[PDB]
Amino acid sequence: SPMDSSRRQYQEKYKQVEQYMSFHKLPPDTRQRIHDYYEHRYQGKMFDEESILGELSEPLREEIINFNCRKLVASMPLFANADPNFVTSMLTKLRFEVFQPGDYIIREGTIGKKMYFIQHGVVSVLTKGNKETKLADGSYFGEICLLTRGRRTASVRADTYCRLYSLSVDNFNEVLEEYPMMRRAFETVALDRLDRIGKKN
Template sequence: GAMDSSSRQYREKLKQVEEYMQYRKLPSHLRNKILDYYEYRYRGKMFDERHIFREVSESIRQDVANYNCRDLVASVPFFVGADSNFVTRVVTLLEFEVFQPADYVIQEGTFGDRMFFIQQGIVDIIMSDGVIATSLSDGSYFGEICLLTRERRVASVKCETYCTLFSLSVQHFNQVLDEFPAMRKTMEEIAVRRLTRI
């Protein structure tokens, strides 16, 4: 049968990536990292989700987002007791991101532009002296502290494993917490506890 369009799109994208890497004469370790990323993130199929989402109604977008994020929502304790309108609001705003082992998701001392929810994987929270304060895995979130305080990042976050994360931008974060002030309070309480640990 004819190859389906999503596989074809993936193959064409990889061809572009290969050409780009040759053109830039990237070293082989970097080429391998990039190819591994594509393989892990897309698993052989590419879709223009944004385009698809632009065409459907808000109601369908919410249903799809809730469905796609169902495992995440079920594993994040923070969502479990929350108002379902709040959860729907957040999941429709989340961006899917993939990081590889040893990647830094967050660098200490930088300003935060987003926070993260871990769908799958393990990250280490690393202090300025290089000590690992704690590790977080599936269902945890991080990066919210500096969005609440508007200060710089207080620690670095480094991936132990491949990590599939969902990020929430600072603009969306503030928008949602303005709509649901009780959740801001909950987050602030958790952040205070975290800061004292750090």
């Protein structure tokens, strides 16, 4: 129902957005991109996700988000085949993020402070002077910078609208100091991914 505080919320908040756009005299293409983002991202409803989750117990918090990430976990070998407690620990630190076609999720050469899991959408991995590798539902990227603490080893550009979950470097490390055999699984893959664009260490 539209009388749901959560749909009425979406409408009022989108109203705020329109006036901000109007105050700053944003171009029409930029206004359309935002409108479209707002629909893909929120889908007519706004929740105070983390305050609602925050009001619950941790087991319910865990149970809920496991339920929500069922396809993501089962599509992703790293997750699907791991200890659930590690999986849960990751899952509860993730932040949902949407991107639009054309967006540079990551720029090569920059400093990186999050990695990403692809729930839905297709993305492009772009190195200066290699062909282009694609990643879709059930893969992740942006992990290399977190392991090395250097710079981004590629740009990553959205082909489609993307529904992603991001993980901060501090959470990534926190989960890996508690689950160290999982560090290796990211390393193996990260080396393989470097090898192929002809790089090392």
